[PDB]
Design an enzyme around this catalytic site. Structure first.
Site, PDB file in Angstrom:
ATOM      1  N   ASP A 138      47.902  58.247  48.961  1.00  0.00           N
ATOM      2  CA  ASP A 138      48.498  57.235  49.812  1.00  0.00           C
ATOM      3  C   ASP A 138      49.997  57.236  49.573  1.00  0.00           C
ATOM      4  O   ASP A 138      50.444  57.136  48.423  1.00  0.00           O
ATOM      5  CB  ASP A 138      47.901  55.856  49.525  1.00  0.00           C
ATOM      6  CG  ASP A 138      46.483  55.711  50.059  1.00  0.00           C
ATOM      7  OD1 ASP A 138      46.091  56.519  50.926  1.00  0.00           O
ATOM      8  OD2 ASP A 138      45.772  54.778  49.632  1.00  0.00           O
ATOM      9  N   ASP A 192      41.938  58.047  44.355  1.00  0.00           N
ATOM     10  CA  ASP A 192      43.114  58.549  45.051  1.00  0.00           C
ATOM     11  C   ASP A 192      44.319  58.369  44.131  1.00  0.00           C
ATOM     12  O   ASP A 192      44.192  57.912  42.992  1.00  0.00           O
ATOM     13  CB  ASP A 192      43.294  57.843  46.401  1.00  0.00           C
ATOM     14  CG  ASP A 192      43.735  56.381  46.278  1.00  0.00           C
ATOM     15  OD1 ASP A 192      43.912  55.892  45.155  1.00  0.00           O
ATOM     16  OD2 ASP A 192      43.943  55.736  47.324  1.00  0.00           O
ATOM     17  N   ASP A 197      48.325  56.732  44.542  1.00  0.00           N
ATOM     18  CA  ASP A 197      49.123  55.859  45.393  1.00  0.00           C
ATOM     19  C   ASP A 197      50.579  55.953  44.972  1.00  0.00           C
ATOM     20  O   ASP A 197      50.886  55.769  43.791  1.00  0.00           O
ATOM     21  CB  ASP A 197      48.651  54.408  45.264  1.00  0.00           C
ATOM     22  CG  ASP A 197      47.167  54.270  45.463  1.00  0.00           C
ATOM     23  OD1 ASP A 197      46.750  54.380  46.618  1.00  0.00           O
ATOM     24  OD2 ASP A 197      46.426  54.090  44.474  1.00  0.00           O
TER      25      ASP A 197
HETATM   26  N1  LIG Z   1      35.631  55.873  50.267  1.00  0.00           N
HETATM   27  C1  LIG Z   1      35.613  55.792  48.933  1.00  0.00           C
HETATM   28  N2  LIG Z   1      36.138  54.727  48.360  1.00  0.00           N
HETATM   29  C2  LIG Z   1      36.043  54.797  47.017  1.00  0.00           C
HETATM   30  C3  LIG Z   1      35.492  55.787  46.237  1.00  0.00           C
HETATM   31  N3  LIG Z   1      35.604  55.459  44.897  1.00  0.00           N
HETATM   32  C4  LIG Z   1      36.208  54.300  44.889  1.00  0.00           C
HETATM   33  O1  LIG Z   1      36.485  53.689  43.914  1.00  0.00           O
HETATM   34  N4  LIG Z   1      36.493  53.873  46.150  1.00  0.00           N
HETATM   35  C5  LIG Z   1      37.154  52.625  46.494  1.00  0.00           C
HETATM   36  O2  LIG Z   1      38.391  52.546  45.819  1.00  0.00           O
HETATM   37  C6  LIG Z   1      38.370  51.490  44.815  1.00  0.00           C
HETATM   38  C7  LIG Z   1      38.858  52.019  43.459  1.00  0.00           C
HETATM   39  O3  LIG Z   1      39.649  53.211  43.595  1.00  0.00           O
HETATM   40  P1  LIG Z   1      41.008  53.448  42.755  1.00  0.00           P
HETATM   41  O4  LIG Z   1      40.732  53.920  41.355  1.00  0.00           O
HETATM   42  O5  LIG Z   1      41.979  54.219  43.637  1.00  0.00           O
HETATM   43  O6  LIG Z   1      41.593  51.951  42.546  1.00  0.00           O
HETATM   44  P2  LIG Z   1      42.961  51.377  43.171  1.00  0.00           P
HETATM   45  O7  LIG Z   1      43.213  49.996  42.648  1.00  0.00           O
HETATM   46  O8  LIG Z   1      44.107  52.347  43.065  1.00  0.00           O
HETATM   47  O9  LIG Z   1      42.513  51.269  44.706  1.00  0.00           O
HETATM   48  P3  LIG Z   1      43.404  51.528  46.026  1.00  0.00           P
HETATM   49  O10 LIG Z   1      44.049  52.898  45.911  1.00  0.00           O
HETATM   50  O11 LIG Z   1      42.515  51.253  47.220  1.00  0.00           O
HETATM   51  O12 LIG Z   1      44.481  50.484  45.873  1.00  0.00           O
HETATM   52  C8  LIG Z   1      36.938  50.923  44.836  1.00  0.00           C
HETATM   53  O13 LIG Z   1      36.963  49.509  44.853  1.00  0.00           O
HETATM   54  C9  LIG Z   1      36.197  51.522  46.060  1.00  0.00           C
HETATM   55  O14 LIG Z   1      36.013  50.602  47.153  1.00  0.00           O
HETATM   56  C10 LIG Z   1      34.929  56.923  46.870  1.00  0.00           C
HETATM   57  O15 LIG Z   1      34.394  57.908  46.350  1.00  0.00           O
HETATM   58  N5  LIG Z   1      35.034  56.842  48.258  1.00  0.00           N
HETATM   59 MN   LIG Z   2      44.322  54.058  44.243  1.00  0.00          MN
HETATM   60 MN   LIG Z   3      44.998  53.963  47.755  1.00  0.00          MN
END
Ligand SMILES: Nc1nc2c([nH]c(=O)n2[C@@H]2O[C@H](COP(=O)(O)OP(=O)(O)OP(=O)(O)O)[C@@H](O)[C@H]2O)c(=O)[nH]1
Ligand SMILES: [Mn+2]
Ligand SMILES: [Mn+2]
Ligand SMILES: [Mn+2]
Ligand SMILES: [Mn+2]
Ligand SMILES: [Mn+2]
Ligand SMILES: [Mn+2]
Ligand SMILES: [Mn+2]
Ligand SMILES: [Mn+2]
Ligand code: NA
Length: 327
Positions: free
Chosen positions: A251, A194, A196
């Site tokens: 988000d 996603d 953010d």
């Molecule tokens: N439902 C879902 N969750 C996913 C996918 N890929 C994926 O990484 N996630 C969740 O999102 C996390 C990593 O995504 P991200 O690259 O957005 O990392 P981030 O730190 O920005 O996470 P955040 O946006 O939740 O804060 C993983 O720990 C996993 O639980 C997916 O295809 N579907």
């Molecule tokens: Mn993210």
């Molecule tokens: Mn997010």
DNA sequence: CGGCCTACG
DNA sequence: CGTA
DNA sequence: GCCG
């Protein structure tokens, strides 16, 4: 010497023990699927310790004294060092339960409790869920409808396009309001599930009512596939592509500028880094940290912060830039 | 033995 | 419960 | 599962 909390040590994006950490994170995920949040935490913490080491682990000796390595995590590492595979990890990997729980929980709107119920009911595929639509929330219907697109990594080109359209809607809703990229991309990631964004305004209070105005303006430009007073929205955008479009999870969070450093720290992650930082704050310093502020429960006061650096300092921690928060 | 991050939607 |  |  390796500090016990992830917020006490730099964790870069590229590290030297991906094989071992990936294996421990499979066990963590499986522990969550079985409802063991404590086992999940230990396996997550142990994997993160390996990410912070300066060099590849080649001998079980190199684990002695590391935090969060006990009999179970050490045996996993020892088997991977000796044989290149850990039997427990492979058994979990190949199991119908693990594979299905991973498939279901990766849907937007589906967590462990929901996935486990569906599993117990005999469901195993995305088509199974589609064939019983009344068992689905609105959020889950959106996640399932756009599942293909949402499984495609979000790239930096997508981030830049999205930030432009969000900045345009924000500027139409409230002059002077700003948009800050957070999440994994702020930590230096090349890809994400996603994008953010954190939105504020330099004049305290002007941001009241902003997110509905932004959402209405995005929806009127045809940019919203799913959403929903509010200050956080977990959306699915219709992102234009050459000759077409793809769904992207976005988000959006609005914070008053007084809270902006706390929101920026919280939403920049990583998720393990932030749980560890909040644990450290409460257990080691007696202060309560969230994405709104840092509270002293004895004096009944909130710490006024102008920057993330201020927050680290108030907690007695060496400052870590976002790129070193990849715990 | 019990704790394990957090608040909003 | 979900965001996760 | 590990730790205070
Ligand atoms: N439902 C879902 N969750 C996913 C996918 N890929 C994926 O990484 N996630 C969740 O999102 C996390 C990593 O995504 P991200 O690259 O957005 O990392 P981030 O730190 O920005 O996470 P955040 O946006 O939740 O804060 C993983 O720990 C996993 O639980 C997916 O295809 N579907
Ligand atoms: Mn993210
Ligand atoms: Mn997010
Ligand atoms: Mn290195
Ligand atoms: Mn064990
Ligand atoms: Mn052996
Ligand atoms: Mn609030
Ligand atoms: Mn116990
Ligand atoms: Mn236990
Ligand atoms: Na999910």
């Amino acid at each position: 010497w390796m500090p016990a909390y992830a917020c006490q040590r730099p964790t870069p994006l590229t590290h030297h023990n991906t094989g071992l950490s990936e294996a421990l994170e499979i066990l963590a995920e499986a522990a969550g699927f079985e409802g063991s949040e404590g086992r999940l935490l230990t396996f997550c913490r142990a994997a993160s310790v390996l990410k912070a080491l300066p060099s590849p682990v080649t001998t079980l000796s190199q684990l002695q004294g590391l935090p969060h390595f006990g009999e179970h995590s050490s045996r996993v590492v020892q088997e991977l060092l000796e044989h290149g595979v850990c039997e427990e990890v492979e058994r979990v990997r190949r199991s119908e339960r693990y594979q299905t729980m991973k498939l279901f929980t990766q849907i937007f709107g589906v967590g462990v409790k929901t996935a486990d119920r569906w599993y117990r009911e005999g469901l195993r595929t995305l088509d199974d869920l589609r064939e019983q639509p009344q068992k689905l929330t609105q959020q889950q219907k959106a996640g399932l409808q756009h599942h293909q697109d949402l499984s495609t990594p979000v790239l930096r080109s997508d981030v830049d396009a999205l930030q432009q359209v969000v900045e345009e809607a924000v500027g139409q809703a409230l002059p002077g309001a700003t948009v800050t990229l957070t999440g994994g991309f702020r930590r230096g990631k090349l890809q994400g599930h996603d994008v953010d964004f954190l939105i504020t305004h330099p004049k305290e209070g002007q941001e009241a009512g902003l997110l509905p105005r932004v959402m209405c303006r995005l929806q009127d430009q045809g940019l919203i596939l799913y959403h929903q007073a509010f200050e956080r929205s977990f959306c699915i955008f219709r992102l234009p592509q050459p000759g077409s479009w793809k769904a992207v999870r976005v988000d959006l969070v609005v914070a008053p500028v007084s809270q902006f450093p706390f929101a920026l720290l919280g939403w920049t992650g990583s998720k393990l880094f932030q749980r560890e930082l909040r644990r450290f704050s409460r257990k080691e310093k007696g202060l309560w940290l969230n994405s709104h502020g840092l509270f002293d429960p004895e004096q009944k006061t909130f710490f006024q912060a102008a920057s993330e650096e201020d927050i680290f300092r108030h907690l007695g921690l060496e400052y870590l830039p976002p790129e070193q928060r990849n715990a």
